[PDB]
Design a protein around this ligand. Structure first.
Ligand code: ZN
Length: 481
């Protein structure tokens, strides 16, 4: 009994590669010479300079006086990832009592780029929106307005979505879609509140987005470490016995078995002591699990295959792995939502400091759509943080909800929040108009180890679900402001 009139949709960026960093210190003169005489931190991101550094590793490897083992991994890492935007080196010198550089800290950082699957996710979404729009009212395509944050991965999703939907049509708005240092500090302080939750014997007293079936967070964290120590030994055994270069026929993003080993070697180090697991590193583990389960399932299966008794993770042999996945999901679903505030006031305070501008703009867009007889649509592409915080504003506004905050699925890549505007169709004029809120968790799956994947390593987007029913326009604007 309602005719569509407009949509304000906020969309999260598409799939991206995990951020990764290798750290070690060297004292050999060849390593010190790379500083070019500088006695402070030096950052190298020019591809020309990265090639120069790369050659140094080949020369340093010729001489085993230094640590050749670290040179071997670093050289491959540098050459594979120096071709990627965002790959960088940080050189932190260490000065002795005579202001002489005796050793330099070599930090190689890379990752965080949108995967080759990102274009497909955004492209599919843009086409669907064009399809849906061309069926409701073709004039809406004539009234599309797109914004994006400054981050490359966000604009990347915005660009491909806009191309698929159809002079930069995307208008970068830092004030609305970009992060603020004040709020990120608050999220960090909330992060400091998360450390005790996993330690000692807390029993998630409030909802804390925690499954009732699961034991204490300190018991769950303890079991995960046991599984990690289990699989790392399986990995080592499989490295020692099997041909690792033949465990997967396809490698994307310039990855190879060595870089794969490095990701997990770091994670295994961070997940070898339950009483030391850092809550911020729980989110790190889960992100790597999604990536490999999407882009490196073949290698993942064989490198963690516990062997035969004597093409899928569905075996009692692979039971230790599925439980590890389930336990990681639980911990990720109990930490990440709470990084944006644990208490309603914190969830609210973080909610406003981050998404106060975006919330105002959405109301204005709906105001425009109502006053303008022509339906329209406005899309905002933002990072993951704004989605949670804006969602917090929605819940903390007291608006009647159709779905509980805890019951909401993970806000994965291409997660969407919609403010669909309609008209109240009756037999009397002057329709009262109505607003309906819907959400989509994006390209997310509940069974990463059972989903059938293509060579493109891509997951379809979950359809939107209604957070509310058709609610009075003026009423929805008053609750928010
Ligand atoms: Zn891939």
């Amino acid at each position: 009994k309602w005719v569509f009139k407009g949509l304000a949709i906020i969309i999260r960026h598409a799939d991206r590669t995990p951020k990764q960093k290798f750290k070690h210190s060297f004292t050999s003169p060849i390593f010190i010479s790379l500083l070019k005489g500088h006695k402070e931190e030096v950052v190298i991101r020019n591809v020309n300079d990265l090639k120069i550094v790369l050659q140094a590793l080949r020369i340093a490897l010729d001489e085993k006086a230094g640590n050749p083992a670290k040179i071997k991994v670093l050289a491959n890492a540098l050459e594979k990832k120096l071709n990627f935007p965002g790959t960088k080196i940080q050189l932190k010198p260490v000065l002795n009592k005579e202001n002489e550089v005796e050793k330099v800290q070599f930090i190689l950082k890379w990752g965080g780029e949108p995967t080759h699957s990102a274009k497909y996710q955004a492209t599919e979404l843009g086409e669907q929106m064009r399809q849906d729009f061309d069926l409701l009212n073709k004039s809406i395509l004539q009234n599309i307005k797109i914004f994006s944050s400054s981050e490359r991965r966000v604009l990347h999703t915005a660009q491909y979505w806009t191309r698929a939907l159809f002079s930069d049509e995307i208008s970068i708005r830092k004030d609305l879609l970009d992060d603020s240092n004040a709020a990120k500090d608050l999220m960090d302080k909330v992060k400091k509140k998360l450390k005790p939750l996993l330690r000692e014997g807390k029993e998630a007293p409030p909802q804390f987005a925690w499954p009732s079936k699961m034991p204490e967070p300190y018991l769950v964290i303890k079991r995960v470490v046991e599984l990690m120590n289990y699989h790392k030994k399986i990995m080592d055994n499989n490295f020692a016995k099997k041909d690792v270069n033949s465990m997967q026929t396809r490698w994307c993003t310039s990855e190879d078995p060595s870089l794969f080993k490095e990701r997990w070697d770091k994670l295994f180090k961070e997940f070898n002591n339950a009483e030391k697991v850092d809550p911020s590193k729980i989110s790190e583990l889960y992100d790597t699990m999604k990536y490999d389960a999407l882009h490196n399932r073949q290698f993942l299966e064989n490198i963690f295959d516990p062997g035969l008794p004597n093409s899928q993770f569905d075996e009692p042999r692979f039971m230790q792995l599925r439980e590890l996945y389930k336990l990681a999901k639980v911990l990720f679903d109990f930490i990440c939502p709470k990084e944006y505030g644990i208490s309603d006031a914190e969830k609210l305070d973080i909610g406003l400091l981050t998404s106060l501008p975006l919330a105002k703009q959405i109301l204005n867009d709906i105001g425009d759509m109502k006053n303008r007889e022509t339906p329209a649509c406005v899309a905002y592409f933002t990072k993951e943080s704004h989605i949670y915080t804006l969602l917090n504003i929605i819940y903390e506004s007291g608006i009647p909800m159709r779905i509980a905050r805890n019951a909401l699925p993970e806000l994965d890549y291409l997660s969407q929040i919609t403010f669909e505007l309609y008209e109240s169709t009756d037999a009397s004029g002057q329709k009262s108009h109505s607003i309906r809120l819907k959400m989509s968790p994006g390209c997310h799956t509940q069974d990463p180890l059972d989903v059938q994947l293509d060579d493109r390593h891509y997951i379809s987007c979950i359809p939107k679900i209604s957070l509310t029913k058709h609610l009075d326009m003026d009423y929805v604007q008053q609750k928010l402001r």
